[PDB]
Design a protein around this ligand. Structure first.
Ligand SMILES: CCCCCCCCCCCCCC[C@@H](O)O[C@H](CO[C@H](O)CCCCCCCCCCCC)COP(=O)(O)OC[C@@H](O)COP(=O)(O)OC[C@@H](CO[C@H](O)CCCCC)O[C@@H](O)CCCCCCCCCCCCCC
Ligand SMILES: CC(C)=CCC/C(C)=C/CC/C(C)=C/CC/C(C)=C/CC/C(C)=C/CC/C(C)=C\CC/C(C)=C/CC/C(C)=C/CC1=CC(=O)c2ccccc2C1=O
Ligand SMILES: CCCCCCCC/C=C/CCCCCCCC(=O)O[C@@H](COC(=O)CCCCCCCCCCCCCCC)COP(=O)([O-])OCC[N+](C)(C)C
Ligand code: HDD
Ligand code: HEB
Ligand code: HEB
Lengths: 376, 454, 28
């Protein structure tokens, strides 16, 4: 039925966001870490070549996030990407630099050219995680958008409105998340001084993630009005104006308070960073990568479940808040897209595992010398 | 400038920029597949070295292609939020399926192509190159399925409860005749582009008496592949012409050497009625006669939405407003006519070039006549010229429609200000200028250095 | 149906390019 399809597609959107974080987040974090853990040309190339073979396929997870939002939640895709217009332009512009940095950095034997492309990679690794965090924090604050009766969307805010302390904290937490992911990927993919510096950056990023996640939870609980869905037919048509919403203080905690089993997701988000650090200390970067992955899973699903059933609450028109029951595509579209996803995501996952398997190996100075002209 | 016009020009520029690099990817990757196949069959290392050199040029083009694609993916949401809402139930599906089937395949395995030369054995690397080729072409399939649906919306119905177009049959989307011919024609054009690329660079080598053996073989591969490609391009172009003749009277009028204007006035009338009924439906009316009238008039909601722009009072539409919308229903036929002509004429020039190159190839006299090499060298821009002409015809000839007879472009736009569009345009244009200069420079430098520098 | 035609045809184009180059390579 329609309701089950919509809830499965909510699950799928969250899964795609988590997989984006897991895969492309370590690319972004390693780009952020590049000036931290690489201090000469060889170290820089080792760091860049730790993700060169896979970063594009990983980024397809962000592209799929966008396309699955379009296909399954067209209202969310529309309202969010138009409402965060300047933020998205900034993300896109930073993202430009990554394919170009990766391919072109070694194409000119000029220190200035390599510096330009290293800086561009850092920009394209830094800006998107920060803006995504700011965007999700603004979701929790409520986004100043509204629907007309004909469901045309109106935005009443601006880019500067987003830059309030709670969304800034969320952006900082998202940055810490990608930096932790990239630090554990550098742990599994490099040796030597880069490995040491990425380890220390991993500890610092995990501490940042834990502090920011705790502060944001406290802030949500005590000083952010939540939204409550009073009445909405979950098998009904995707029309946000056919529902009843209330904005009560502390309401964002309702899902977890009512259902104590849902508390595991914030527990994963908060404690999986500590377990990632423990694994890194235990000499186990594979378990560390798993723990960092579960941190991404827990944090993102914590944000979703806090918002559930809302996906995009509206600070100026609460009835215009988007839910998983009213933001979706038709039943036919949800069904067929689910079938297609269930066929191909397993296949994509298997051949992505295959590619990572064939390419598994630590990028080192000797590896770089052996293949200097081939590598990025 | 109207912010809607800034958004139109932004999508214009960014799609055009993206498709400066896509056609080369589409054709060149199959050329690399052929080079690696020949290497596998014969064991001749020169074809492996050719794969690596031409693939280095491929990577240079591919990086900008990826970045420009990134701009395009989210532009639908950023600048066309109403478009996204109104048609996402159908249109977001081919984009998602592109991501799922094609983007994952090509992006995942392009890294194996460039960096798996050693970790993969000869057959696995050949398979990986073929998978990159098929992934990029399947991405063509799905994105062009979306674009074709924009040209010929099929298997969709308006839902009163969600105020949007909804899917009715997925198969009518997947086998949209327009999307089929669009896919095959565009990928044939990409094959032409890659073939002409390697032929022109090889001809430049042969004119300077350098890289002779690689240049000869690369010219031969390009000659055969691009002869087949340009022939298929022309045939599928005639197929595309036939399909748009069936479903798009405007593009049919363009090729005819330039009725519908007059026809649009009854459609405008029915559309005004449908728009009034749809405003009633949005207001929550469900009276039976209202819904029966709307079911009778829902095939013209697009023309009503078009009329909305030229008539602020939809209840009382003066004849002047009717005529403004009448004129605005038909785009300027001259850009479309001249686009079609460049595309077709450049195709004829390319066919002549490919046939002469193939004759010299089959005779084994590639380097015999210098004028053959000079013609091949000077023919390098022609595929891009014809391709941008074809896409200009495609995207200007459906104007004013974002979805033909469903969603006007002027109604598909987001709620943005000329300040935000100025920011996005300045940033995108400046960054793209820098990127294009750098990419043309690197491409020129490494093509000039040639395979011997590898 | 054009997708099947394209699949067969691209296989044929690549096969013919490969075969022609295998034949012609000694002459080159
Ligand atoms: C539930 C999720 C899956 C449960 C199993 C998790 C396994 C991880 C950890 O327990 O095993 C660890 C091994 O894992 C690897 O080392 C790192 C990969 C971890 C990725 C886990 C996926 C996370 C979820 C993503 C979605 C335990 O080993 P350790 O003692 O810590 O030794 C580490 C280092 O000290 C030593 O590394 P090494 O010995 O060289 O690895 C060899 C081998 C062993 O790994 C296992 O056999 C495979 C684990 C399952 C893989 C999914 O692995 C190598 O051959 C390479 C396999 C990697 C294949 C790709 C996986 C990464 C893809 C990146 C994601 C991008 C796409 C996203 C979808
Ligand atoms: C997850 C799922 C199933 C479905 C997704 C649902 C959803 C809203 C999807 C978003 C769709 C939209 C509007 C998308 C457009 C906007 C956008 C960002 C698009 C880009 C998409 C991408 C790629 C997003 C990547 C995600 C990234 C990189 C950052 C955002 C993730 C973050 C950091 C969210 C904030 C997490 C947070 C601070 C929770 C607070 C807290 C603390 C407790 O300590 C707690 C403790 C106890 C209880 C609660 C807390 C507690 O909330
Ligand atoms: C509307 C749509 C617009 C789009 C159009 C786009 C078309 C794109 C294609 C653009 C290329 C067009 C080139 C013109 C062809 C003639 C070349 C020539 O005259 O020789 C000149 C350059 O020749 C070289 O020296 C370069 C060596 C070969 C590299 C080829 C350039 C790669 C460009 C990659 C571009 C990136 C492609 C990927 C992204 C597009 C001079 O050479 P010379 O040795 O000094 O000769 C001296 C003797 N003489 C002076 C008397 C002659
Ligand atoms: C006929 C083919 C074709 C057409 C019309 C388009 N593209 Fe494209 N696109 C490609 C063919 C392609 C490709 C061949 O698959 C590219 C080019 C180089 C590359 O990396 O993949 C690509 C890359 C590419 C990427 C990066 C994906 C990745 O790296 O995995 C995105 C996000 C898009 N495209 C999106 C679009 C959108 C939203 C379009 C609509 C305007 C579009 N493309 C037009
Ligand atoms: C899938 C989907 C898609 C695709 C693929 C595409 C592809 C493309 N494209 Fe596009 N568009 C679109 C979707 C699209 N598209 C849209 C939606 C729009 C909006 C409407 C209008 O028309 O504007 C545009 C628009 C547009 C434009 C502008 C027009 C006007 O007038 O406005 C241009 C120029 C272009 C080009 C182009 C190109 C060249 C290409 C090749 C790449 N475009
Ligand atoms: C290689 C290059 C080239 C060439 C040669 C050509 C050649 C040609 N062509 Fe082309 N196109 C192109 C490239 C091209 N092309 C493009 C790119 C485009 C865009 C995409 C599509 O398909 O649309 C077109 C498009 C197109 C079209 C439309 C489609 C739609 O609208 O959708 C048509 C109709 C045509 C026709 C044609 C012809 C007839 C010819 C001759 C025979 N076209």
């Amino acid at each position: 039925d329609y309701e089950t399809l919509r809830f499965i597609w909510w699950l799928l959107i969250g899964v795609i966001l988590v997989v984006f974080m897991i895969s492309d987040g370590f690319d972004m974090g390693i780009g952020c870490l590049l000036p931290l853990v690489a201090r000469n040309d060889d170290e820089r190339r080792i760091v860049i070549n730790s993700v060169g073979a896979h970063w594009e396929g990983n980024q397809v997870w962000l592209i799929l996030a966008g396309g699955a939002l379009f296909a399954a939640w067209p209202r969310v895709y529309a309202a969010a990407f138009s409402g965060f217009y300047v933020a998205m332009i900034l993300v896109l512009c930073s993202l430009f630099f990554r394919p170009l940095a990766f391919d072109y950095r070694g194409k000119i034997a000029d220190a200035r050219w390599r510096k330009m492309w290293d800086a561009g990679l850092v920009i394209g690794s830094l800006v998107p995680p920060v803006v995504f965090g700011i965007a999700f924090g603004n979701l929790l604050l409520g986004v100043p958008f509204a629907f007309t009766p004909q469901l045309r969307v109106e935005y009443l805010g601006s880019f500067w409105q987003l830059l309030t302390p709670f969304p800034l904290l969320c952006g900082l937490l998202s940055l810490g998340m990608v930096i932790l992911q990239g630090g554990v990927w550098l742990q599994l993919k490099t040796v030597g001084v880069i490995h040491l510096r990425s380890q220390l950056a991993t500890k610092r990023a995990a501490l940042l993630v834990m502090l920011c996640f705790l502060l944001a939870g406290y802030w949500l609980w005590v000083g952010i009005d939540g939204f409550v869905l009073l009445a909405q037919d979950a098998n009904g048509p995707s029309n946000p104006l056919m529902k009843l919403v209330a904005v009560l203080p502390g309401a964002w905690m309702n899902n977890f308070v009512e259902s104590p089993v849902l508390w595991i997701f914030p527990l994963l988000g908060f404690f999986c960073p500590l377990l990632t650090v423990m694994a890194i200390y235990r000499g186990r970067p594979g378990w560390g990568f798993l723990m960092a992955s579960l941190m991404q899973f827990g944090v993102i699903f914590t944000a979703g479940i806090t918002l559930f059933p809302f996906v995009m609450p509206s600070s100026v028109s609460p009835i215009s808040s988007l839910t998983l029951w009213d933001s979706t595509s038709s039943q036919l579209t949800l069904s067929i897209m689910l079938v297609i996803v269930l066929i191909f995501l397993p296949i994509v996952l298997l051949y992505t595992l295959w590619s990572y398997y064939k390419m598994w190996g630590r990028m080192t100075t000797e590896t770089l010398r052996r293949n200097e002209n081939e590598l990025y | 400038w109207d912010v809607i016009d800034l958004s139109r020009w932004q999508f214009a520029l960014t799609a055009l920029y993206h498709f400066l690099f896509v056609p080369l990817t589409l054709g060149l990757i199959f050329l690399l597949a052929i080079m690696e196949t020949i290497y596998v069959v014969t064991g001749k290392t020169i074809y492996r070295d050719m794969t690596r050199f031409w693939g280095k040029l491929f990577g240079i083009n591919f990086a900008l292609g990826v970045a420009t694609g990134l701009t395009m993916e989210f532009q639908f949401g950023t600048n066309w939020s109403f478009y996204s809402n109104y048609v996402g139930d159908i249109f977001g599906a081919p984009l998602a399926m592109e991501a799922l089937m094609a983007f994952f395949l090509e992006s995942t395995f392009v890294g194996l192509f460039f960096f798996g030369w050693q970790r993969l054995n000869k057959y696995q690397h050949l398979l990986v190159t073929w998978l990159v080729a098929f992934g990029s072409n399947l991405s063509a399939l799905w994105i062009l399925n979306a674009n074709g649906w924009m040209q010929y919306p099929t298997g969709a119905h308006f839902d009163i409860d969600t105020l949007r177009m909804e899917m009715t049959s997925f198969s009518e989307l997947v086998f949209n005749p327009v999307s089929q011919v669009k896919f095959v024609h565009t990928v044939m054009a990409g094959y032409v582009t890659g073939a002409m690329f390697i032929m022109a660079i090889s001809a430049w080598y042969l004119l300077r008496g350098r890289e002779r053996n690689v240049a000869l073989r690369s010219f031969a591969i390009g000659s055969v592949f691009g002869t087949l490609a340009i022939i298929g391009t022309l045939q599928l172009g005639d197929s595309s012409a036939y399909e748009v003749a069936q479903v798009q009277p405007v593009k049919l009028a363009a090729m005819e050497g330039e009725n519908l204007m007059a026809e649009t006035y009854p459609r405008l009338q029915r559309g005004r009625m449908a728009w009034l009924l749809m405003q009633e439906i949005s207001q929550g009316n469900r009276e039976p006669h209202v819904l029966q009238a709307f079911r009778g008039l829902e095939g013209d909601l697009g023309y009503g939405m078009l009329l909305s722009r030229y008539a602020p009072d939809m209840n009382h539409v003066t004849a002047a407003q009717y005529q403004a919308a009448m004129r605005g229903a038909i785009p300027q036929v001259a850009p479309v006519f001249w686009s079609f002509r460049i595309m077709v004429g450049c195709g004829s020039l390319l066919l002549l070039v490919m046939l002469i190159a193939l004759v010299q190839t089959l005779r084994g006299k590639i380097d015999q006549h210098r004028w053959v090499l000079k013609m091949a060298l000077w023919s390098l821009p022609l595929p891009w010229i014809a391709i941008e002409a074809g896409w200009f015809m495609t995207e200007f000839g459906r104007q004013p429609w974002a979805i033909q007879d469903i969603l006007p472009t002027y109604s598909a736009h987001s709620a943005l200000t000329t300040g935000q569009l100025a920011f996005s345009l300045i940033m995108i244009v400046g960054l793209y200028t820098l990127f294009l200069i750098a990419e043309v420079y690197l491409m020129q430098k490494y093509a000039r250095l040639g395979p011997s520098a590898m | 149906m054009w997708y099947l035609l394209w699949f067969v045809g691209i296989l044929l184009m690549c096969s013919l390019s490969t075969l022609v180059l295998v034949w012609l390579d000694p002459r080159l």
